Design a binder for this molecule. Structure first.
Ligand SMILES: Cc1cc2nc3c(=O)[nH]c(=O)nc-3n(C[C@H](O)[C@H](O)[C@H](O)COP(=O)(O)OP(=O)(O)OC[C@H]3O[C@@H](n4cnc5c(N)ncnc54)[C@H](O)[C@@H]3O)c2cc1C
Ligand SMILES: Cc1cc2nc3c(=O)[nH]c(=O)nc-3n(C[C@H](O)[C@H](O)[C@H](O)COP(=O)(O)OP(=O)(O)OC[C@H]3O[C@@H](n4cnc5c(N)ncnc54)[C@H](O)[C@@H]3O)c2cc1C
Ligand SMILES: NC(=O)C1=CN([C@@H]2O[C@H](COP(=O)(O)OP(=O)(O)OC[C@H]3O[C@@H](n4cnc5c(N)ncnc54)[C@H](OP(=O)(O)O)[C@@H]3O)[C@@H](O)[C@H]2O)C=CC1
Ligand SMILES: NC(=O)C1=CN([C@@H]2O[C@H](COP(=O)(O)OP(=O)(O)OC[C@H]3O[C@@H](n4cnc5c(N)ncnc54)[C@H](OP(=O)(O)O)[C@@H]3O)[C@@H](O)[C@H]2O)C=CC1
Ligand SMILES: CC(=O)OC[C@H]1O[C@@H](S)[C@H](OC(C)=O)[C@@H](OC(C)=O)[C@@H]1OC(C)=O
Ligand SMILES: CC(=O)OC[C@H]1O[C@@H](S)[C@H](OC(C)=O)[C@@H](OC(C)=O)[C@@H]1OC(C)=O
Ligand SMILES: [Au+]
Ligand SMILES: [Au+]
Ligand SMILES: [Cl-]
Ligand SMILES: [Cl-]
Lengths: 488, 488
């Protein structure tokens, strides 16, 4: 035994890298980190850093911040900020230009992390399994390419994450995804986002901000309400608010056929049976784990829900030394989760003392033109398996939007409790500054929190978050199944 | 006894009104709410609403929001928002114009409250005490003027709040205050705010945003560091950042003589001995309780430190039926505190079950050009009477300012724990979205929270608040009163 490296991690993921680093620094165990490429890039999108660092949270938040200005610039007019708002649109190129330079820069600190750190080592290629202790490195995903390295390790961590799901439709390959969206030469005039998940709604916002003068953004979705799995009142108020911001939402609609045109712009055949014309078309269908190529089969690693890696709560797979974290497992697909998954794994096997990642009560956010922030349970799901549930609601129009002209920017809070307990089971927020608020909310919730905590804390009185403490009288109840304002 | 009015409240304060409204609605007791005037007013500044509804938190924040846009307009350019950069300045008039129409509107919904609510009654004039059950109403503060109404009550509540503290100096009456600041006909070019308190810093920001082209805002302060009583590191970083935003701060400097000029502009004599010219000069020296005029002497209400009303923990005074809340008591000068104070008082006497306002660990905020949010103890005060105390720090440049060209806008978090306990005793924050964050933080600290509770909560990962859960290693220790790193 006594193998070449202690850990081979497939993928320099938000969690991959977190795992690798900690093992090599806090434990000195030699780590080899495999990944596809040096810096973020259009040929093969996800690089050293993660589907989050390179083509996710970083460039996303940047672009959403850029798109936010559009509203903000119009808004300041009411604040006596007079300027020529005559048909003023943004320059897409200068944004990506300055985006690339910031991401590129991040990949530069990463390279220079490996140079500085010992135990750690970056290996560029496409990693695959040979068996229990051998990781092969090839120059193509194609398993008949050149063998580049062959790494002999104690433990294997799989953090290859997730990938855009296409839809089985003629013309599919004319559609761009979250990946390609980022590196578009030019801003789309006629824009069609396709889907109802995070990426759909968030990107809907961006292109809407960065539409060239006169452009539009339609949003289509298979079902009747966007963002399945959110406070069904938050979902509605956002769909309305996207409207008021210029994004034409479209429920119970799906394309079936796509064909390219004379000037290159894309033509679309819909469910209702219409034909429309769009420069671009993006698909936010979802994300399948990236495990097709890994040959888990040849090492006996459990592959189920379209390739999701079977793991236990300590991230251990069907073999006792190979592990997987983040999107490839397909439980909770977020950056700070895989980060936690990676640190848990580090402490579990190298840290001596085990620890399991707590998936219950994780606060997350949606970065749409008005941002959403939830933590915990929906009404639907709390009344599902809880006996008596109270629902508190409160929706107010921030004092600044009377002047700004955006009287449609209703900020919204929803709290879901256990009537038997007082226990806060879910909190849902829509409006500006929500993703910040919710983060501390989830500190209270994973701590175990009761509404009799929430309201009995003195406020910070010119803010939005202070309205959490103003909720005593419930809006209505859910009695073992059905809404009611019950008695006896 | 069967006295006419159950409760007379002197002053429709944020707390006064709250207490008034509560008694009348939840307990149906007849309440009469005396106050000076109808809507927010440039002759007698406060009104039906409170010193923060009328000449505080509302008009303040609107203006701060307005001033904020200056940065945001410059910043957007780096996001491809090309415009007429050409030294365009704000229009002060259209701001106050929209400000009044928004405040003025709030008082219109207040008059309509009184018309609609039963037991409640607004009485206009300057209130005073005759004895323990008799409130007199005069048309002037002058106790020699006309007797307007004489009100017979079971209970009296003093909620007259606070007033600008002037400085005993020649030229004093040439200065404007927080009150007069709001109604200035025109935007000041040559601006001097005086002092280093909440008001000073926040208003420094506003005029700095709302300076005409070429204008400058100087800040002077008696001592050597602004904002006595905040995390001594936060204070520094803010004093720096104000510099970067264009406000020339000045320490150990104090005016001595002010004289009015030929063109109207005001001339100033300083401590260092210089002479400088300013269009305006604001004094943020503080706020003494407004109890001089009340005639407590007659009714036997205890009057001590600058007239502040002596009260017990249940807000009760020297007499068994006269109460005082808010800024007049001088315990904790905030809107949501007096609200809580009033709310508790209502329960204390009319609500049957007494209850005391919890002054320990109240989160508050400062609405400066970068906003501050703190809750709990300073660095110095924990090491004062706590055995062994840890300090965690973290200062990061939010990912967006790499593009916005505001590389000076450092976000800051400081957590202060009880090393023995692990208990979070104080959290301090500087940066955009701070005040929103801090609010829920304070829900954690009246709940009792540990740094273990903090970091072990999963994050919301593109945000600023999530860096609360990124703090495991202390920066340095305070062992029984000294900056230290270990025990031996
Ligand atoms: C557009 C977008 C925006 C997002 N925004 C947010 C957000 O704001 N907040 C948030 O919390 N989450 C966000 N996420 C989710 C987040 O990106 C993921 O949940 C998280 O990054 C998963 O990380 P991971 O540890 O599984 O590995 P990943 O971060 O997904 O990285 C996987 C790595 O493995 C590499 N790899 C793939 N195949 C191989 C192989 N053949 N051999 C070697 N290496 C390989 C890839 O190149 C990549 O570098 C976003 C996702 C997307 C797509
Ligand atoms: C510029 C400024 C900005 C502020 N911003 C904030 C903020 O952002 N957030 C925050 O939490 N706090 C803020 N405050 C503090 C806040 O104003 C107070 O803490 C709070 O409003 C005090 O309320 P109160 O209950 O004591 O009564 P007040 O709100 O002070 O109301 C007192 C009322 O009594 C009336 N009155 C006075 N004398 C008499 C008498 N002769 N007879 C009858 N009536 C009388 C007055 O007209 C007034 O309407 C700010 C204060 C100022 C000055
Ligand atoms: N925290 C953050 O800010 C972000 C996190 N992420 C993470 O990455 C993941 C990326 O997945 P994402 O692409 O956003 O989508 P999701 O996984 O959120 O869901 C897919 C959406 O598209 C709809 N859909 C699915 N299949 C089809 C189809 N064949 N035809 C039409 N519509 C279909 C689904 O409808 P239905 O309800 O019927 O299934 C659903 O509403 C997210 O789930 C999240 O975990 C991504 C972006 C931002
Ligand atoms: N929550 C919010 O957003 C706001 C809350 N408020 C509340 O209302 C109160 C208003 O008081 P504020 O005016 O802001 O200031 P403060 O009452 O907080 O303190 C006064 C400041 O001015 C300095 N000072 C005092 N006297 C003199 C003098 N004679 N000459 C020169 N300098 C002097 C003091 O220095 P030193 O430190 O040496 O004593 C101190 O820095 C605050 O205490 C706060 O509770 C006010 C505004 C906003
Ligand atoms: C009449 C009306 O619609 O309310 C508008 C605002 O009035 C002021 S008193 C407060 O402003 C702020 C920013 O705190 C807040 O009031 C409360 C309810 O405390 C309301 O805003 C908010 C946070 O709801
Ligand atoms: C070394 C550096 O300063 O930047 C690294 C950034 O990497 C990305 S992964 C994160 O971005 C964001 C905005 O969440 C955040 O990472 C962490 C530390 O969680 C850092 O951003 C920042 C400063 O917050
Ligand atoms: Au991220
Ligand atoms: Au207020
Ligand atoms: Cl990341
Ligand atoms: Cl208020």
């Amino acid at each position: 035994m006594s193998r070449a490296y202690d850990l081979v991690v497939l993928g320099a993921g938000s969690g991959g890298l977190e795992a690798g680093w900690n093992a090599a620094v806090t434990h000195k165990k030699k780590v080899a980190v495999v990944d596809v490429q040096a810096t973020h890039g259009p040929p093969l999108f996800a690089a050293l850093g993660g589907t989050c660092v390179n083509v996710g949270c970083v460039p996303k938040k940047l672009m959403v911040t850029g798109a936010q200005y559009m509203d903000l610039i119009r808004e300041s007019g009411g604040f006596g900020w007079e300027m020529d708002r005559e048909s003023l649109c943004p320059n897409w190129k200068t944004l990506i230009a300055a985006k690339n330079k910031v991401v590129n820069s991040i990949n530069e600190s990463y390279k220079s992390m490996f140079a500085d750190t010992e135990g750690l080592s970056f290996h560029m290629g496409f990693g695959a399994l040979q068996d229990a202790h051998t990781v092969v490195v090839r120059k193509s995903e194609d398993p008949h390419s050149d063998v580049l390295e062959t790494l002999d390790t104690e433990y294997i961590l799989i953090a290859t994450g997730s990938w855009p799901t296409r839809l089985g439709v003629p013309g599919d390959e004319f559609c761009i995804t979250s990946n390609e969206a980022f590196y578009l030469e030019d801003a789309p005039k006629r824009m069609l986002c396709v889907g109802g998940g995070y990426i759909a709604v968030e990107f809907a916002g961006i292109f809407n901000g960065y539409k060239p003068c006169g452009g539009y953004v339609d949003l289509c979705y298979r079902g009747d309400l966007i963002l399945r799995g959110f406070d069904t009142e938050v979902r509605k108020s956002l769909t309305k608010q996207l409207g008021a911001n210029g994004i034409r939402v479209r429920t119970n609609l799906n394309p079936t056929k796509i064909t390219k045109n004379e000037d290159g712009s894309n033509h679309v055949h819909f469910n209702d049976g219409t034909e429309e014309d769009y420069d671009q078309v993006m698909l936010a269908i979802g994300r399948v784990p990236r495990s097709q190529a890994l040959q888990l089969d040849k090492a006996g690693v459990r592959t189920g829900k379209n390739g999701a890696v079977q793991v236990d709560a300590y991230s251990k797979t069907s073999v006792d030394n190979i592990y997987a974290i983040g999107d490839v497992t397909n439980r909770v697909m977020l950056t700070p989760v895989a980060i936690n998954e990676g640190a848990a794994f580090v402490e579990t096997v190298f840290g001596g003392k085990p620890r399991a990642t707590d998936h219950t009560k994780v606060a997350c956010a949606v970065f749409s033109i008005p941002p959403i922030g939830t933590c915990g349970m929906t009404e639907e799901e709390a009344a599902k398996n809880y006996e008596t549930v109270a629902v508190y609601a409160s929706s107010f129009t921030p004092l600044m939007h009377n002047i700004s002209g955006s009287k449609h920017k209703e900020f919204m809070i929803r709290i879901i409790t256990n009537e038997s307990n007082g226990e806060v089971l879910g909190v849902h927020m829509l409006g500006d500054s929500a993703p910040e608020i919710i983060q501390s909310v989830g500190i209270c919730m994973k701590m175990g929190a009761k509404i009799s905590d929430f309201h009995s804390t003195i406020g910070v009185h010119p803010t939005s978050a202070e309205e959490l403490c103003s909720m005593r009288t419930p809006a209505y109840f859910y009695e073992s199944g059905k809404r009611v304002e019950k008695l006896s």
